[PDB]
Design an enzyme around this catalytic site. Sequence first.
Site, mmCIF file in Angstrom:
data_model
loop_
_atom_site.group_PDB
_atom_site.id
_atom_site.type_symbol
_atom_site.label_atom_id
_atom_site.label_comp_id
_atom_site.label_asym_id
_atom_site.label_seq_id
_atom_site.Cartn_x
_atom_site.Cartn_y
_atom_site.Cartn_z
ATOM 1 N N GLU A 294 0.782 -1.238 0.000
ATOM 2 C CA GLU A 294 0.000 0.000 0.000
ATOM 3 C C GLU A 294 0.820 1.298 0.000
ATOM 4 O O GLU A 294 0.290 2.401 -0.229
ATOM 5 C CB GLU A 294 -0.837 -0.080 1.282
ATOM 6 N N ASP B 58 -6.298 6.947 -4.795
ATOM 7 C CA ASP B 58 -5.783 5.608 -4.969
ATOM 8 C C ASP B 58 -5.903 5.197 -6.427
ATOM 9 O O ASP B 58 -6.391 5.955 -7.278
ATOM 10 C CB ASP B 58 -6.441 4.653 -3.982
#
Length: 162
Positions: free
Chosen positions: A11, A20
């Site tokens: 991540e 994202d």
Amino acid sequence: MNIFEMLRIDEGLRLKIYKDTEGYYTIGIGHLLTKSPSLNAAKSELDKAIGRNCNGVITKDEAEKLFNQDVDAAVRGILRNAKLKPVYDSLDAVRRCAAINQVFQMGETGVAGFTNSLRMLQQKRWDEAAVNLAKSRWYNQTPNRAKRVITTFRTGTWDAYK
Ligand SMILES: Oc1cccc(Cl)c1
Ligand SMILES: [Cl-]
Ligand SMILES: [Cl-]
């Protein structure tokens, strides 16, 4: 290697609001804030989550705190799912980390559509599961990461994470 290091690798860490891979506001270690396109909505959510006026920026400890609570929630989300729990409990420790990672990424929801793969994993048909898992929007949208998780489930080792 453990779940935290593993997801930290998948991540990354960002201390400022970011979008994202799907275009949603997120922060820290993959913490989704909102699916809405309103940055103001996202800042709000952030303040609510941290407990203070952040102005879109947090500290590392803040980020680590959100992460802990998120890993926790994920696992718990698994154990609470009736379709999920039994699969999860049938796996060994490494493969369990790969289940947590997928859930963390996609939600218990996203994961409920993997029924077929779940069955193969429960049956311990690794190579079969790996192929079935690749046939998905998830692998086609984030192939490099999907690869590492799939290898993880296929092998039961941390080699994809080296
Ligand atoms: O996403 C997954 C994949 C396998 C097992 C569980 Cl429990 C979740
Ligand atoms: Cl929080
Ligand atoms: Cl990727």
